[PDB]
Design a binder for these strands. Structure first.
Ligand code: MG
Ligand code: MG
Ligand code: MG
Ligand code: MG
Ligand code: MG
Ligand code: MG
Ligand code: MG
Ligand code: MG
Ligand code: MG
Ligand code: MG
Ligand code: MG
Ligand code: MG
Ligand code: MG
Ligand code: MG
Ligand code: MG
Ligand code: MG
Ligand code: MG
Ligand code: MG
Ligand code: MG
Lengths: 82, 93, 57, 136
RNA sequence: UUAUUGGAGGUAGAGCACUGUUUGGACGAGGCCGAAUUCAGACAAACUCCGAAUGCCAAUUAAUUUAACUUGGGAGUCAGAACAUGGGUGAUAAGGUCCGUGUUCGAAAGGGAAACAGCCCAGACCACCAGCUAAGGUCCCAAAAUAUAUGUUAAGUGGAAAAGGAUGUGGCGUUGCCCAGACAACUAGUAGUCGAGUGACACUGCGCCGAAAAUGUACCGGGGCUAAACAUAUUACCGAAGCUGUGGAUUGUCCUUUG
RNA sequence: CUGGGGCGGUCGCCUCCUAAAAGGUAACGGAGGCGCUCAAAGGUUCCCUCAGAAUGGUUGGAAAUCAUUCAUAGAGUGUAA
RNA sequence: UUGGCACCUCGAUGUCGGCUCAUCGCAUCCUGGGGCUGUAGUCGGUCCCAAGGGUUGGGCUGUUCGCCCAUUAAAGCGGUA
RNA sequence: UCUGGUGACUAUAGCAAGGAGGUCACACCUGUUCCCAUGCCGAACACAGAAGUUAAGGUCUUUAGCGACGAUGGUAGCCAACUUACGUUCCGCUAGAGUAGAACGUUGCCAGGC
């Protein structure tokens, strides 16, 4: 029956949905979103262009592949061929 | 001088510890003039490797033929039972 | 090159994937049977839903 | 009363008290060691109260170290309040021992003396202990 | 769902190269105790040069089974609970509270756990004085072995507690004392005379004490047990509304030669 | 809102951790910010590489410029992570 | 005892002290039996086994508790809504 | 084959040391009238040139001492199963991190001249 101290913070942000939005192998279309981040965790490759610091999105038709070309960097390409 | 082992038949299961209750110890061999053969030496004679030179030395084992002039490379000494498991061998060539 | 499966233990009280595998072999209630051709697609399923089934030959 | 000087954040979790020991279970410094075998905490005041009882039987002779410096804080909410408004302040420090890791290493002594003095400080600790000497 | 391949991400673990915390050795940095670095060690939810088990999205992939989705009428729920594990809070306190993830109850009757929504087996369409089996058991109340073989304990441990204490008792290992004769016991102040074991350690199973609460024995369910207890294996048998045998029920599929 | 209520503190957005290697995921659990600023701190074309550690050199902050050498990012990015 | 949790009771489970009347544990206050004393004896300290029986009259405050007076072989600690 | 230009290969390729040469090809320098320009100075950028030099850059051959890659065996963790309230065992799959065996002083496409 004693007056307990006041908390200070609580107070979380909401969320953002991150991570992969398509996966290795399937068939995508020329506006769709591959991957998105608050930075650059995956560089783009051929036929994939960046957005405003986010949302690696495929230029044209095809299927997707993930790939590395340095020792740490990773990239995404789409080949329209089939 | 005094060692012997059997070429431990590979792909053993996780019942490897109920033969460690008897005083065995698994081991492998390396070396220039060999290929990696898992052996099963019994540690009852491993009060008799201190009794030749100590730690650094040479003692042969004879797993069939080709008693390798070897040297004790490393332990895996797990306490709380005061025992040694998985010692290793290394030829000198 | 044949296997016949028999469901011996029951299916309630087992988690949601193993209860969902055991109809894909075709078993439907206990003490049933089904005869299946041997296939490495089959003998991966009965590894998962082992400790229930009794097989032979 | 060994304390950390600086601590990043003053209110932290409690360590996962399972498993084996990380390492540090081979003695390196003294000839004679004392390791543990059961899984409690030690609360930064045993570790000096096992140091003063250790020193006086040897009359400050040979070298004696410790090996367990407490890093983690732990908080006790004040005298009889209802549950939940935030964590309480710290009151001590702690370092969790796993089974099978060395507490004390002593040197500069015969065997028959130091084996007594480790026993006399093994009753000041909330753990079960066992004598040991330089795995060779 | 499963095998195959290809992938996303940084937990458990590990580690000190990174920001930070550390105890030890030599290392310089005034005129008798201290000021950068180096060696050997440690710690971490907001520390990672590393980094799995599993899950997760996709193969125009192959095997097995039965769903899935679009539209349109009709709702009900928005007071959950206990177990098993990963966690925060709490005091590694609760039949506590709060999330993840499974099961069962809720909405599920039977058999076992002495009785006992949440634990252990298993899902009741109804009949019969039929057989096998699951979980738990087999001297009696009460269906079934006073079964077989190896051992163990002497306390009712089984049939509720730790730190510690101790020539309890077994299978285990190492080692130093030895008919030249110790360790028991005699007589000397140099130590003589007695004829089969004695100490240290090291690891383990089973015990004992530590053990005090309130109508009446009083946690075995009771009688009672030195095997009717524990460990180790091998054999039958009982054991449910499970599954079979069989009679008729209602609905569906397929033959449809309407069975 | 509330581990019954008034009292104290909170009420929306942003960033971590808890969160259990996809996403998601609570608590009166742990830490921090914002309710703008910039006519150039926006666009383009070229070119350059850092904070420090030494080593000496009018002034000496221990360190306000100058060179030389070893510097993989140990600096910087208008604002908290 | 002071709390923590909200599981039963709000279509009522009457709540502190005291009188009446008990009943039960032993971690024992007296009495019975011992060990040990830094026990000369008489007294006294400390510990073990022991529930069969005993456990006081007054002033003060609603009191519980408490202090104080005069005794007694002693003025025990608790459970029983 | 070798020297140069442009590609791919996770630094196995690079730094750290040491020895070898020529400039037929890169450099080093000779200058600033012009092309252009240093918040200054043609050191750099550009331009004009070829007497010198292999010391330097780059090239080539050794050295595993610096980093880097790295197997077989183990041990911790762990999906599934069993037993149990123990900071648990036991059985069946996947399987690291550190540490050792070591491999390693690059590889290969296409051009123009030998
Ligand atoms: Mg960890
Ligand atoms: Mg954690
Ligand atoms: Mg709980
Ligand atoms: Mg849940
Ligand atoms: Mg259900
Ligand atoms: Mg019953
Ligand atoms: Mg009866
Ligand atoms: Mg029928
Ligand atoms: Mg309140
Ligand atoms: Mg996540
Ligand atoms: Mg209470
Ligand atoms: Mg509740
Ligand atoms: Mg009502
Ligand atoms: Mg009523
Ligand atoms: Mg009333
Ligand atoms: Mg008594
Ligand atoms: Mg009485
Ligand atoms: Mg009066
Ligand atoms: Mg010039």
């Amino acid at each position: 029956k004693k007056g307990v101290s006041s908390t200070k913070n609580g107070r979380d942000s909401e969320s953002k949905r991150l991570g992969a939005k398509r996966a290795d192998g399937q068939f995508v279309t020329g506006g769709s979103i591959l991957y998105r981040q608050r930075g650059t965790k995956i560089y783009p490759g051929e036929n994939v262009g960046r957005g405003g610091d986010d949302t690696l999105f495929a230029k044209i038709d095809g299927v997707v592949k993930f790939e590395r070309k340095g020792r740490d960097k990773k990239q995404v390409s789409v080949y329209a061929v089939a | 001088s005094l060692k012997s082992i059997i070429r431990q038949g590979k792909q053993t299961r996780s019942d490897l510890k109920q033969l460690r209750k008897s005083g065995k110890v698994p081991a492998v061999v390396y070396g220039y003039g060999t290929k990696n053969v898992s052996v099963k030496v019994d540690e009852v004679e491993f009060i008799k490797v201190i009794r030749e030179v100590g730690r650094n030395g040479v003692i042969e084992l004879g797993v069939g033929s080709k008693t390798i002039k070897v040297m004790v490379a490393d332990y895996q000494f797990d306490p709380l039972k005061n025992q040694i498991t998985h010692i290793d061998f290394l030829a000198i060539n | 090159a044949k296997l016949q499966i028999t469901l011996t233990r029951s299916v309630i009280g087992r988690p949601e994937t193993q209860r969902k595998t055991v109809e894909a072999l075709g078993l439907k209630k206990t003490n049933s049977s089904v005869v299946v051709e041997d296939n490495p697609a089959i003998r991966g399923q009965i590894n998962k839903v082992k400790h229930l089934v009794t097989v032979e030959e | 009363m060994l304390l950390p000087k600086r601590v990043k954040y003053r209110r932290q979790h409690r360590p996962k008290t399972t498993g084996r020991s990380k390492g540090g279970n081979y003695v390196t410094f003294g000839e004679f060691g004392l390791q543990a075998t059961t899984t409690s905490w030690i609360t930064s005041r045993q570790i000096e109260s096992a140091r003063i009882a250790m020193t006086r039987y040897m009359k400050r002779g040979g070298k004696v170290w410790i090996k367990i410096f407490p890093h983690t804080p732990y908080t006790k909410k004040p005298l009889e309040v209802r549950m939940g408004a935030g964590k309480g302040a710290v009151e001590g420090w702690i370092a969790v021992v796993k089974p099978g890791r060395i507490l004390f290493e002593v040197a500069g002594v015969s065997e028959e003396v130091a084996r007594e003095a480790l026993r006399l400080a093994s009753h000041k600790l909330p753990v079960k202990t066992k004598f040991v000497k330089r795995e060779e």
